[PDB]
Amino acid sequence: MGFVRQIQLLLWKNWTLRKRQKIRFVVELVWPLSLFLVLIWLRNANPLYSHHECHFPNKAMPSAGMLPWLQGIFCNVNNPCFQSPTPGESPGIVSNYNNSILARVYRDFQELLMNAPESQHLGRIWTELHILSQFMDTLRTHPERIAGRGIRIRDILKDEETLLLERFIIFSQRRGAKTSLSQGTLQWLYANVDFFKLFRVLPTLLDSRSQGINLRSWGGILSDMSPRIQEFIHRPSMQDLLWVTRPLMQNGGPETFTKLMGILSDLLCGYPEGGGSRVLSFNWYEDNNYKAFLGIDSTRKDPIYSYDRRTTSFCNALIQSLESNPLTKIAWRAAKPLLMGKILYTPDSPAARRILKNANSTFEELEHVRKLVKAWEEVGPQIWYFFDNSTQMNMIRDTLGVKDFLNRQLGEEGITAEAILNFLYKGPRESQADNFDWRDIFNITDRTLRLVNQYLECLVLDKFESYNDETQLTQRALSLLEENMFWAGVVFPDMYPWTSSLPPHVKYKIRMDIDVVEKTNKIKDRYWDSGPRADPVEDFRYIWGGFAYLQDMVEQGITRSQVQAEAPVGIYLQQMPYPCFVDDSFMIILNRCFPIFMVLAWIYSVSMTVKSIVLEKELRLKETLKNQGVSNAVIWCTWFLDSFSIMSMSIFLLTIFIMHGRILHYSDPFILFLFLLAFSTATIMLCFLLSTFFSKASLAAACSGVIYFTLYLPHILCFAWQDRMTAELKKAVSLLSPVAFGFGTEYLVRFEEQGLGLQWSNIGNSPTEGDEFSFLLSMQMMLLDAAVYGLLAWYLDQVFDSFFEREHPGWVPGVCVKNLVKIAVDRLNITFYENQITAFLGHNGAGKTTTLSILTGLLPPTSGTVLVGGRDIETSLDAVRQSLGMCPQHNILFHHLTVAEHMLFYAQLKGKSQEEAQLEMEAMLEDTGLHHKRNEEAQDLSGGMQRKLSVAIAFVGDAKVVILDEPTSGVDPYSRRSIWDLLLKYRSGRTIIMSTHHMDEADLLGDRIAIIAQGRLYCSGTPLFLKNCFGTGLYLTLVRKMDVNELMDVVLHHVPEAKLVECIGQELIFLLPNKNFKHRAYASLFRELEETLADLGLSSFGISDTPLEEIFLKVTEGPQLNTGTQLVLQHVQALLVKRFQHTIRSHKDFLAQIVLPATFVFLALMLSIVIPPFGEYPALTLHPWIYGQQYTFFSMDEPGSEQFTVLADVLLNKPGFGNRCLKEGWLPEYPCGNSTPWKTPSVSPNITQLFQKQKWTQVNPSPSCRCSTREKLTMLPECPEGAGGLPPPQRTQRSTEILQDLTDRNISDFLVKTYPALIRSSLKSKFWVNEQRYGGISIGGKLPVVPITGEALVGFLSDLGRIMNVSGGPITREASKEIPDFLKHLETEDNIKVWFNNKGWHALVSFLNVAHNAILRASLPKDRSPEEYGITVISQPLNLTKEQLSEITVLTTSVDAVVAICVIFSMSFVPASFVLYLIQERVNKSKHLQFISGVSPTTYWVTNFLWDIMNYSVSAGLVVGIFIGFQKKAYTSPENLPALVALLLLYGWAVIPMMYPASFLFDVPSTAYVALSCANLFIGINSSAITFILELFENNRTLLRFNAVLRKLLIVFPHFCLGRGLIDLALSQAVTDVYARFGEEHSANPFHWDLIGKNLFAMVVEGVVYFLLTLLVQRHFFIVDEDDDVAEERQRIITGGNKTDILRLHELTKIYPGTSSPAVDRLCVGVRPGECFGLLGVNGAGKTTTFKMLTGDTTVTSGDATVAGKSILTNISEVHQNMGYCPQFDAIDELLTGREHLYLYARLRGVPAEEIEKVANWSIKSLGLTVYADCLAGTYSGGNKRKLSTAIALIGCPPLVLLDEPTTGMDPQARRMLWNVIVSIIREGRAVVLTSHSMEECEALCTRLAIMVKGAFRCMGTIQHLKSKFGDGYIVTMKILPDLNPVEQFFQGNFPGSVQRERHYNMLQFQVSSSSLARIFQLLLSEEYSVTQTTLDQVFVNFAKQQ
Ligand SMILES: *[C@@H]1O[C@H](CO)[C@@H](O)[C@H](O)[C@H]1NC(C)=O
Ligand SMILES: *[C@@H]1O[C@H](CO)[C@@H](O)[C@H](O)[C@H]1NC(C)=O
Ligand SMILES: *[C@@H]1O[C@H](CO)[C@@H](O)[C@H](O)[C@H]1NC(C)=O
Q: Torsion angle of alpha carbons 1784, 1790, 1794, 1798, nearest 10°?
């Protein structure tokens, strides 16, 4: 014995078993790898996105001026990131555009031209000209001296003397007109009157009114400025300006719209490093867009065109070109509603009018610019008239500039003057000098200014219209929006049209359409994305759509209407900076596919392990191993290692794939391997538990995978409620292994995100705050579920005259028994001995099995006394079960093993090393006779060789006692002789005990016989002893040829004491008396009997002895039928009852037809009802508290200034932020509270150490955070400790929020470096994150305004205009009266800014409101208690517009396209529960039996279908009831309910016949049920989803065709019809439901050849075609010879005189297609009436094909056979009414009772209704089944089934009867009881045809035999005729002081040929041939002798002995 040596044998056996599949061995290692290859493809099809830091510029609101507003719109269109803090997020700076060339140039000009202390006297020259050319140069009419006039004058006056003066004219006048100091004096009352003007050539005397002289005051000014102007124009700023303006003025240049935009950006904007980065969005699924993912374009239909009245022609001709162009089509749809929009303000009343009038400043100042540009229309030509024909320019600077002093000045001018060019650019009019440089500048400025004026006419700038109720506003809004000219609409919901006084709390709502506003269902993203949410298009609809602008305008109007503060402040929006991140989209699908894929990859190993475990116990191969001495623990521990040695090799490759495939980058693969190992262990140890519920292999292999998969689903609904679940309950629900796998997978993903994997040091830790459930807990829960399952499985397995012949003094006894007792054994004393077989003959339950069990050591006796080879059975067991060997009734053979391993395995189990086992294997394999085919598999042997091997194994090892029972039951007679030889070669020195129920066997091989009748011995002795200790006549048979009266006298001479005991056809059995002398007489009789044989007319004469079975029994105690229409109408109503009684009392096909459909439809219907609706956008008041608990910082920049120290007070204390804690109401859901004082938090002393020791610079504050490197990519930076400086002060406001001062601190540092530390605590779920910080307000910041005031500018403009004669016109006088209010509103000086975080959708407009609401309270007078005023904003969108409802409808019907799939998959469980019954009935030949009784397959199939429809209707009605119960529309409405009922019924109508041809292709119900519910699901998923998802592509011009052909080609499937019908009934209702919203009547109806009308016709058509296909497929399945045989062959030529026959069988044969030797040759026999034929047949020669022909199974190839005139070649339906049948198998329905099981087969024949009552009772009483008459057949013993089969075969009164093994598993009493019945019908006149394996019954009741050797018949005749003619024998036996030599001496002389026989101490057995000479030669005596004859069994062995 041993343990570690038993484990080795079991493990070797399992390893050898596993290698021989080679399909399991390949799939188990390939399937997971192919499952995980897609998870690598997904990795490679989802790249990784990383980005650096982001700092964004700020956006100016309209309240901050108009120039900054427009500049911020133009610069920040793309919202760029910058990597480096912008200048706008500093304590005082707001400007952010301090780098444009237009600002550097202005700074240079303001620096070195203006602010010039050098000259500063250009004003002096201005004053000079302003005083001169007003009085002295003009002097129009004002009186003066003689020398002065308008344009020309002379001083020639005051002369009195007649006229050297020519010389004076030459000297004083020198080539110069009126436009000499002493020359006239030198030439000199001539010397008194010549000179009058004492003022000489000196130039400065013109304004001699009171006092004025200024002529030589220019020199320094016009000689010092020019070098500085040169230096200014040669500054780098002007270099950049000119180098950028080099294009945009040339030709063939600015059209690429990227050079132009680049120029404008570089000239107005000033952004560095290229411009920015434009972070993207990538979500698309937070909006349910479904076409940003699917490739479809999402663009609304372009709006209508109409030639608009009263606008312009140019603008109107521009709109069409700009709107129909394919490029600028979407960038103009986003801008049109702002430029040309319109605003509506429903409550028309004085208060609303005043508010909207105050909110009108922006458009007013934008109209002032249009007026200012239009003024050029008049200014232009007046300026032009100043340069061509002008009394100033052309007459002053063009006539001269003199010609002499001007010449001298030009010579002494600057570097280059070119006075000729100075005159060419001085008004050349009649010249046309064309290089010219003067006309082109004016020519270009006019043509570029009128174009601007022409564009500016398109804008609409009066865009407020009033109504008087909201409904008219909504109507007008949709009317305008169809044209795309709708901006928002304003509604004041708290004032009537007569309101005049504003209440001190104003509320309004902005109403826009949903394409330009964030949705009001959600306030967050459902799934947290690592990204700033800074995409200018998909993330900022509140800015590019115009919500924020209009909100600001209305807030400013409401403020200005009730304050009158006259000191404005603006608003700037600034977005919080964001750290660097890494966005991985693969962690979304890994977390969802890793557990699914892992659970799905063992779905086959689980099934193939449970199947093996269950099968090994189903074949009773486990109790055998226990009998040999193997415990249960060893079996378990070997199955474990068997299943575990493969999963290890699989995990080792899965780990390699997962690592090297980049699915996990950095994870320490050892932990991953050790993590999958625990899952494998739990899975195996769960297979062990699942193996203890099932009894069949197929059912277990089918249900195991399904149960395994089902046990994981509690994790899918456990990943939603992830936050409510406490860890204490996470540990309780984790007792299921597949959910403990997912719980660890989540932590795996969370660790992989962070840049650091598992690494052996954080598996015990968690990436959370207080979860307490780590990654170790998952592994430790799996390794505990393993043990729990193990204990549970192990536990649940256990609970479920003298009689005793005098012996010899001794021949070494081997097994003694003394006074054995147990309770049915009363003191029996048996003593088995050595080297002789003993036949333990007994009853079938009178005490044989119990004593065999006692002797075989499996149960204990009470107080008996046993012995085994000199040992006991209680004191020692481990030593006795070493030589004791046994074999049971069944077989002990492992499939997929060979003979060699069988012998070796059992030899080693008995306890023997490998060498002895391999030695004795080669010895037993010789005696067994299996030298060849020693490598053949255990299965696929002959079928008798398996029994040979089974009994050969019983002798393996050192065996002494062999207790084997029924060793040769159910085998052909030749293999029985083979096994007998085996036994006879092994009783050399070993005791053998052989229990059997056949008595033909217990004589030829048996030396002692013992009978246990009443639980005790009664008789024990050799067969001769028993045959003599009773005394019976020696049976004398006699046969005749084709006269008892004269035959009686023959034996009358030697009259005995018995006569003709029995006389059957051509037979005569005689019975003589035993003993009583009769020495000579008896011998003499066979003298005249053997002599005159022919003369008398006999043919044979035997003389056998009383059979051994005879004594055994002693020592134990049709009217006229129906036909035609009545027959058919009775067949149908009998089959209906048979199929009703089977289901009325079964539970499997009750919950397979009622419970599953309702359950699976109920779950789907609830799934359809717990999904939130799509659309339905509510109001949603906007305030910062719609988010939870949060931080809101604060900062007070620029202190000391008044009106800000009160603004910072009414923001913190007083009313607080926002509008919560008012003083009266404001929402009851959000109450008030109470506050705490300022409190700086505490820090670890190491932090306060590191800040007071090092040197931190203004540019470099507290240490920086580490960003992801090339190989370590982290979701968020690492941020070392002490990252944002010291914590700031804190409070807890009355509105329950912590605000914190950030004064005197760097904000764009604190915000960047402390954000990860907040997300790391607000995370732990990744769903609906809080972010804990959404905004804050920074008070202060001013930008520099223009110093140039108003009136001081119009003074300059007016003077410049008046000095050159322009004076403007009527447009100028109206455009210049508004200038000191226009130059004031461009820029607002002091203004605040608000920080917002875009991760919350509504956090922008929530804090803009807070800022405006604080500005209101910062300026009201000092007697109004600012805790009463406020403003609230509501954002209620506008009605959907029938184009945005199509998408809502698609998303709505998408959830009914899943209910359709579930209904299809749940209505297919009912038709698959009928194919199971059909499959079970096709096998076991129960359908063939009804066909034989005659059911004409048409009626069979029609009745089955007619019952199936009615059975299915109940489930259909139940499903309809559930649908009615849910009260859903579109199905349960009064109009659609018929459309649902007619859709569910026709589906069954169509699909039931479609699965009927699947009953022919399967043999196991479970495999069919698995393969059907998968094919139906596969078809039903793809027939109702492909067509759904292929209709969304309105383009591609080939999808709408490839779908339109599928819509008419997929209709051959009844799944598609139902799916499309159920989807159509939802789509039609949706379409007719969106219309009722607009007030319409769609009024559609089904049954219209487009909704379901075509489907309801296709189903009817294709339900009557598959039935015909079923009928067809069921139509396409259903020389040298012995003289005696030749005599019949030649006699069967004239069947005219002997046509009384009941079987002709003319000629038959069955040549197979793939064969050449026919299985049946030409044969021909007649069956006279009153005889039963044999038709024995050699095994392996072909005999069963004959019954397959006769019954009607196969085709009779070239045959001819008739029963009673009707042939079995054409007329095979009326003949079947004259033929019974008892099949070899048992065709019984195990749910019906015997009585009704007889009623069915009675009704299938005729026997009208009122007589089955007696026909049945007759059959029941005749067959002796009264107690089991009605007891649910199937509970029957196994022999009772044979009685029932015979009873249902004998029904009515058929002339001919076929029997096929009528008795197999019966005790002899039942066998005789049944044989009497078979004789009692042949004794009436009806023929019988029998076939069997036991020669005993063929010899007990028969009249003719015929043995079918390989070809055709070989012999024929009666029993005695065959015995004599084909045999010899008369086996003689004699008893004894014995001496064998004297007995052998007399047989030495005579009787030549005796092959002697078995030898014993006194028993001799010989064999004479045929002479009957012993009976007369046995006078010479010296006590017992008997002369039997060879049995009929020995004759069959003679024929089978060859071949
Ligand atoms: C603007 O930029 C100039 C140089 O480009 C610099 O001297 C000046 O200080 C800047 N002004 C502000 C407010 O940053
Ligand atoms: C705030 O209200 C009063 C202050 O007088 C105080 O009694 C109360 O406890 C404070 N807290 C709350 C929650 O009311
Ligand atoms: C700060 O304080 C300790 C004290 O020496 C220092 O060694 C270490 O770097 C820091 N420890 C912690 C827990 O921050």
A: -60
Output the residue whose Cα is nearest ligand 1's atom 5. Answer: 99
Strands, sheet with 1068-1070, edge to edge from the N-terminal-most edge strand: 1068-1070, 1036-1040, 1098-1101
Ligand 3 atom 9, closest CA: 1246
| Cβ(110) – ligand 1 distance below 6 Å | no
With beta carbons less than 8 A apart as the criterion, state whether 727 and 774 touch.
no
Query: Any known ligand binding at 848?
Result: yes
CA–CA dist 813, 834 (Å, integer): 6
Query: Distance, CA 1390 to ligand 1 centroid (Å)?
Result: 19
By most ligand atoms within 8 Å of CB, the mutation choice from 1221, 1232, 1234 for ligand 2 is 1234
Which string of b and e fits 1794-1815 if b means at least 16 CB within 10 Å?
bbbbbbbbbbbbbbeeeeeeeb
526 is in an annotated binding site: yes
3-state secondary structure of 782: helix
Record the tokens describing residue 647, joined without a space: 């999963």
Asked whether 464 and 360 are in contact (CB, 8 A), the reply is yes
The secondary structure of residue 1587, as a DSSP letter, is H
To test the ligand 3 pocket, which listed residue (1244, 1246, 1250) has its Cβ within 8 A of the most ligand atoms? Answer: 1246
Q: Is the CB of residue 303 less than 8 Å from the CB of residue 482? A: yes
Give 298's Cβ-side CA count (13 Å radius): 13
Q: Which residue has the tokens 């000014």?
A: 221
Residue identifier of the C-alpha nearest atom 7 of ligand 2 = 1234
Kind of pairing, strands 570-575 and 991-995?
unpaired
DSSP, collapsed to helix, strand or coil, labels residue 994 as strand
Q: Which residue is closest in CA terms to ligand 2's atom 3?
A: 1234
Angle subtended by helix axes 914-927 and 899-911, to nearest 10: 130
CA 216 to ligand 3 center in whole angstroms: 82
* Reported structure resolution in angstroms: 3.4
Q: How, if at all, do strands 1732-1733 and 1887-1889 pair?
A: parallel
Q: What end-to-end distance do the CA atoms of the chain give, in Å? A: 46
Chain breaks in the chain (C to N over 2.5 A) after: 163, 179, 188, 401, 434, 800, 823, 1042, 1117, 1678, 1936, 1982
Which one of the ligands is nearest to 1294 CA? 2
d(C-alpha 497, C-alpha 349), whole Å: 5
Q: Which residues contact 1890 (CB under 8 A, 6 or more apart)?
A: 1732, 1733, 1734, 1735, 1859, 1862, 1878, 1897, 1898, 1901, 1902
Ligand 2, atom 5: nearest CA belongs to which residue?
1234
Q: Within a 10 A sphere around the Cβ of 1703, how many other Cβ atoms?
A: 19
Of all helices (H) and strands (E), which one includes residue 496? none
Residue type at 546?
Answer: G
- Residue 304 DSSP SS3: coil
Closest atom, ligand 1, to C-alpha of 98: 1
Q: Is 1045 annotated as a binding residue?
A: no
What residues contact residue 184 under an 8 Å CB cut-off, 6+ apart? 168, 171, 172, 194, 195
CA of 1246 to the centre of ligand 3 (A): 6
Residue nearest to atom 2 of ligand 1 (CA): 98
**Determination approach:** cryo-EM
User: Other C-beta atoms within 10 Å of 1252: how many?
Assistant: 7
The Cβ of residue 923 has, within 10 Å, a number of other Cβ atoms equal to 10
8 Å CB contact between 180 and 190? no
Residues 6+ apart with CB under 8 A from 313: none
Ligand 2 within 6 A of CB of 1234: yes
Task: Give residue 1312 CA to ligand 3 midpoint distance, Å.
Answer: 24
For residues 495, 499, 502, 504, the Cα torsion angle rounded to the nearest 10 degrees is -50
